[PDB]
Design an enzyme around this catalytic site. Sequence first.
Site, PDB file in Angstrom:
ATOM      1  N   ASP D  36       0.936  -1.085   0.011  1.00  0.00           N
ATOM      2  CA  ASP D  36       0.341  -0.268  -0.002  1.00  0.00           C
ATOM      3  C   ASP D  36       1.162   1.618  -0.027  1.00  0.00           C
ATOM      4  OD1 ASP D  36       0.898  -0.384   2.808  1.00  0.00           O
ATOM      5  OD2 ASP D  36      -0.121   0.842   2.955  1.00  0.00           O
TER       6      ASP D  36
HETATM    7  P1  LIG Z   1      -2.434   4.669   0.949  1.00  0.00           P
HETATM    8  O1  LIG Z   1      -2.483   5.500   0.404  1.00  0.00           O
HETATM    9  O2  LIG Z   1      -3.130   3.638  -0.174  1.00  0.00           O
HETATM   10  O3  LIG Z   1      -3.228   4.193   2.324  1.00  0.00           O
HETATM   11  C1  LIG Z   1      -3.121   5.525   3.604  1.00  0.00           C
HETATM   12  C2  LIG Z   1      -3.838   5.115   4.406  1.00  0.00           C
HETATM   13  C3  LIG Z   1      -3.756   3.732   4.626  1.00  0.00           C
HETATM   14  C4  LIG Z   1      -3.719   5.899   5.602  1.00  0.00           C
HETATM   15  C5  LIG Z   1      -5.566   5.243   3.465  1.00  0.00           C
HETATM   16  O4  LIG Z   1      -6.012   4.321   2.770  1.00  0.00           O
HETATM   17  C6  LIG Z   1      -5.565   6.569   4.252  1.00  0.00           C
HETATM   18  O5  LIG Z   1      -5.992   7.732   3.686  1.00  0.00           O
HETATM   19  N1  LIG Z   1      -6.915   7.026   4.714  1.00  0.00           N
HETATM   20  C7  LIG Z   1      -7.914   8.153   5.516  1.00  0.00           C
HETATM   21  C8  LIG Z   1      -8.291   8.413   6.233  1.00  0.00           C
HETATM   22  C9  LIG Z   1      -7.057   9.206   7.101  1.00  0.00           C
HETATM   23  O6  LIG Z   1      -6.543  10.132   7.084  1.00  0.00           O
HETATM   24  N2  LIG Z   1      -5.974   8.190   7.586  1.00  0.00           N
HETATM   25  C10 LIG Z   1      -4.789   8.969   8.495  1.00  0.00           C
HETATM   26  C11 LIG Z   1      -5.238   9.867   8.828  1.00  0.00           C
HETATM   27  S1  LIG Z   1      -3.944  10.768   9.814  1.00  0.00           S
HETATM   28  C12 LIG Z   1      -3.481  10.575  10.931  1.00  0.00           C
HETATM   29  O7  LIG Z   1      -4.581   9.142  11.864  1.00  0.00           O
HETATM   30  C13 LIG Z   1      -2.127  10.727  12.230  1.00  0.00           C
HETATM   31  C14 LIG Z   1      -2.730  10.574  13.516  1.00  0.00           C
HETATM   32  C15 LIG Z   1      -1.360  10.780  14.593  1.00  0.00           C
HETATM   33  C16 LIG Z   1      -0.383   9.828  15.062  1.00  0.00           C
HETATM   34  C17 LIG Z   1      -0.525   9.638  15.765  1.00  0.00           C
HETATM   35  C18 LIG Z   1       0.812   8.885  16.443  1.00  0.00           C
HETATM   36  C19 LIG Z   1       1.520   8.157  17.642  1.00  0.00           C
HETATM   37  C20 LIG Z   1       2.444   7.534  17.599  1.00  0.00           C
HETATM   38  C21 LIG Z   1       3.113   7.531  19.097  1.00  0.00           C
HETATM   39  C22 LIG Z   1       4.529   7.482  19.175  1.00  0.00           C
HETATM   40  C23 LIG Z   1       4.599   5.959  19.656  1.00  0.00           C
HETATM   41  C24 LIG Z   1       6.093   5.710  19.321  1.00  0.00           C
HETATM   42  C25 LIG Z   1       6.837   6.661  19.040  1.00  0.00           C
END
Ligand SMILES: *P(=O)(O)OCC(C)(C)[C@H](O)C(=O)NCCC(=O)NCCSC(=O)CCCCCCCCCCCCC
Lengths: 156, 208, 114, 77, 341, 176
Positions: D36
Amino acid sequence: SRGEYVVAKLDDLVNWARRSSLWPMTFGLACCAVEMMHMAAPRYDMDRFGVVFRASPRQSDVMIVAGTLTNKMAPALRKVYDQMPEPRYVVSMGSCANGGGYYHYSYSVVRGCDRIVPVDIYVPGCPPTAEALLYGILQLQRKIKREKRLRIWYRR
Amino acid sequence: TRPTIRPRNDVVHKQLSAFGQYVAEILPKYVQQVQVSCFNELEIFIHPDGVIPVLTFLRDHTNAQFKSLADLTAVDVPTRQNRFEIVYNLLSLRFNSRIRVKTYTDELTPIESSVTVYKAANWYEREIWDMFGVFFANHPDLRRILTDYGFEGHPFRKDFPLSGYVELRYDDEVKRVVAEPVELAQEFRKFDLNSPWEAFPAYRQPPE
Amino acid sequence: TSVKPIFSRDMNEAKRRVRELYRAWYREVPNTVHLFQLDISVKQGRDKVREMFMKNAHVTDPRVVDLLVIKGKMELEETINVWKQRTHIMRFFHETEAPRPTDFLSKFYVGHDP
Amino acid sequence: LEAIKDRVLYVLKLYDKIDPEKLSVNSHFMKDLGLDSLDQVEIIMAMEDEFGFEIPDIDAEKLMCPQEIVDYIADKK
Amino acid sequence: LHHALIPHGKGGRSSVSGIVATVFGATGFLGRYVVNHLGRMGSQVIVPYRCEPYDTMHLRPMGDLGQIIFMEWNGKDKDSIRKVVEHSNVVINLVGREWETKNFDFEDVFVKIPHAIAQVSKEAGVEKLIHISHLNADIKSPSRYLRSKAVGEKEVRAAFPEATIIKPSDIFGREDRFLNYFASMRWFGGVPLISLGKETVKQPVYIVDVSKGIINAIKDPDAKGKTFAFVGPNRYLLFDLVQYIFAVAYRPFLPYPLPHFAYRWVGRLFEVSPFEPWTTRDKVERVHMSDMTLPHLPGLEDLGIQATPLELKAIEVLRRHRTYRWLTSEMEDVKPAKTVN
Amino acid sequence: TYKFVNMREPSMDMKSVTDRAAQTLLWTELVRGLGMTLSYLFREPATINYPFEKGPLSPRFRGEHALRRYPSGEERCIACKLCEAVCPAQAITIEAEPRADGSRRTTRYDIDMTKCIYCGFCQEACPVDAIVEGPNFEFSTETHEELLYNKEKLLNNGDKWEAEIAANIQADYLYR
Ligand SMILES: *P(=O)(O)OCC(C)(C)[C@H](O)C(=O)NCCC(=O)NCCSC(=O)CCCCCCCCCCCCC
Ligand SMILES: CCCCCCCC/C=C\CCCCCCCC(=O)OC[C@H](COP(=O)(O)OCCN)OC(=O)CCCCCCC/C=C\CCCCCCCC
Ligand SMILES: NC(=O)C1=CN([C@@H]2O[C@H](COP(=O)(O)OP(=O)(O)OC[C@H]3O[C@@H](n4cnc5c(N)ncnc54)[C@H](OP(=O)(O)O)[C@@H]3O)[C@@H](O)[C@H]2O)C=CC1
Ligand code: SF4
Ligand code: SF4
Ligand code: SF4
């Protein structure tokens, strides 16, 4: 016997020094800390008893948790308590530090500092008066008076 | 002499009404409503996109020198479509007066930041974001101010539980503070206090 | 029309923002492990970042995506400046939570949970 | 170009999800290998660390194949 | 079950797990971990202590209000034992010292005290008894520690037929003896090993795994009168184990062979300390002895616990022993030690 | 009306210039501060000799809680739950039932002293002066549990402090 007498005298001497010399860490969070200042005030001078504030945790023996312990503050309190060297004692002061206080049912308040640190003395009030805090300090002193570390070790 | 009842100020009421008409005439593009409360507090309800023009006018106009931002808050009203209600309180020292400006928004619609008009709006809008979730578009530094680091959810929303979802304690196994789901020793006892008899007929809502 | 977008308008640019945020987090796990003296591996940190990104894979509204990446960027900038402590970074891992069973038989055994 | 292709194949074979047996220079990451967007982003970052240069997001979209990756790398010299 | 022993809640700090456990010797490594687990479950815990109450302060934050109760007991006082086990349906026995004092010996702390606890527990009608033994519990072991361990295990089995006898191999953790003892030999120049440590095989077990096995043994219905052997996943030669310990601690490693009689004499010298000895002759014997393999006994995987490998948790213990130069070094830097399988 | 705190310009005559120069060289204001400190040293300290000397209080002081009785010995509380309803911190828990003689009394009356804010609303809302905030303020504890009072503890406190509580009520009730 002679060994029992010697250890009794020695651990009565050691407890006397700790009882007569208390160095609370300069640590006050909320309105309860004002009563700490009034205890340090001339009316109820705590330096009279050998109780004197020190800033660094490394040079402190008693943590007077006076105020509200929030979620954003609990890690810092635990860190300074850990950095405070042994022997160390804890006096929870006021309802906020004892239990939850006025803010018991809140999303960002820790209900009782005893959830984070082992508390030796609990002083109730909101805020506890300077006399009440002084009485709590004296009760902590008398609690130190009955410790028998050398007597436990000798019979160990 | 009616010692119990608070006195009233017709002169100040008339002055506030005249100034409300004046500002409504000057800015008809954004000002939607003007009210004067019975205790002499002028209130202006405007479109959300008019925040910068209306605030700049009320701040720099010669006849309205509201140079001090008294407060900046929000009110969560779940029933309304635009639940969040951004409220600005302004103080004019030259004319010794106060005014209130109210805009509406929801979770996803951003409100233009007023940091370019008042500098206290920096921390006030940081607080509004951290408490309600209202995002301000052009902000020098937007992040949490009051909540804990990594805190999830906005506490001041009316759909947020009082006790939250997690609590903190010290776990000796991992030698660090840990966050666990909330579990109260005594549940908060909810009290039904409202009386079933109407109190003020003056505020009675029509049955349509 | 007339609906104000937070950023990036359509979904493709929102996905671009998501990928940028994922790259930024991916190039930060080794620094987080080194600075905070975490006992976890770098691979575990990358896996946890991937998991936290994937738990929002069902979002189909661009404004929600923009808000999610904004919050993720806020959390990223909190970690870099060491505003968070080891406590929060390990709170990301639920290292002390008891394993709640998800099977009907065990849930029936333990209590009245649905 | 042989050195570039060898380095890229070596880097790809270090990825756990990718099978070295089914990996080929003309294999599409999304279709042939069944990955992906996030895995492709990780691969592009690994290539950035490998050849020591920065691949922007626009240039990170046109690298769906190892052949495309090596062609782009040779393009930037 | 009594109406007050019915489980309630979602297994949190303020829940009721229906477990009332008296934890003997809870003022120690395994004791503190087990008490913490019980308090996290939300159980009633009774901690009998004979030391200063100051030494039992760290156990207070491990339970909610009214969950941890501290009582004073004497080892050779059946009245005190009955007082502390009267109202508990689980009794956990962890009492044991690695050295012999003037008042208590290996026979006293491993035979007389466990047998007295088992006997009094049966009189009070406790439902469950858990007793901690050692994996290398041999009736004719070179170590009096293991001899007394086996004798006391037999006595406890005789006194309380419905007991669960846990036999951990070797506990490694933050407050452990094992890793700290091996990593504290920096001061004495080099590292003395018997036959260079090429003849000793050990598989240590994680402290959290041991505590979780003890906890699940209580909740397991069909482990009433059983014997369990808690061992780690990987078996290490002693030389490779010490080399890995020093590599993780980032200290110079200079192992040399010390003859057995000289090591015994050195252990005899170090046990004259009135305080807790650094090492003893029986400690040397236990270190030299290999970990016995008992495949017929159940283990952590049978209880429901996956064994935690040493490599994952070796940096929690040994990071303290590093210097400022290597404090920030990560866990992945040092490769895992060779195993014997 | 307003006043300027710091708007006084200094003079420039030779006498004042020499005086200011002498102050700059010879530390006159520093010596004045020393003299003030020395005077405070020679004054009398204002420290009381606690616990042999107790600080002044008032009949309105609000300290440890207590449950009172009628002179006949019967309890004053009638389980009206006004204190429970008016307690800001919800530190009071009350459960009642008809007694064997039909009296409306309490079976459970708990005050969490670690949750109470010591505000006095319970004693002002009590229609029979049952719950009172007594004069005692030195009841610190070594354990958390002992600060969770119940009906027996509050009745014991009321019996112990009945005389002083009655005197304070007599001295203050005309202002209520
Ligand atoms: P490919 O582009 O085909 O697939 C992309 C994905 C799988 C993300 C999806 O197809 C997609 O884009 N879906 C649309 C919905 C979406 O936007 N999802 C992603 C949202 S951004 C998000 O959720 C960011 C969150 C912040 C991250 C938190 C960090 C946590 C880690 C903490 C640290 C722990 C260890 C240090
Ligand atoms: C034996 C021990 C004696 C102890 C004396 C105790 C004195 C009082 C103790 C309290 C003082 C402690 C705190 C003092 C700290 C501050 C002191 C201080 O600031 O003094 C410096 C102050 C200048 O600093 P500012 O005014 O702040 O500059 C910024 C201007 N805007 O003045 C000074 O420099 C002091 C210099 C000493 C004055 C010397 C004057 C004497 C000169 C005449 C001698 C002539 C001899 C030769 C002529 C012969 C002719 C025949
Ligand atoms: N850790 C290890 O190497 C292994 C240990 N085990 C076994 O597991 C058990 C727990 O081990 P561990 O935590 O390491 O040991 P500890 O020495 O750390 O703890 C022993 C506990 O027993 C108490 N105790 C000791 N002597 C007496 C006595 N005479 N009377 C009453 N109480 C006493 C101590 O309390 P106080 O401080 O008050 O004296 C302490 O709380 C022991 O039975 C041990 O043999 C099994 C396998 C490996
Ligand atoms: S107990 Fe009362 S006085 Fe003390 S910090 Fe809390 S609110 Fe303030
Ligand atoms: S003094 Fe106030 S907070 Fe305390 S029990 Fe009475 S009403 Fe509640
Ligand atoms: S207000 Fe007085 S009578 Fe009413 S329930 Fe409380 S203590 Fe009892």
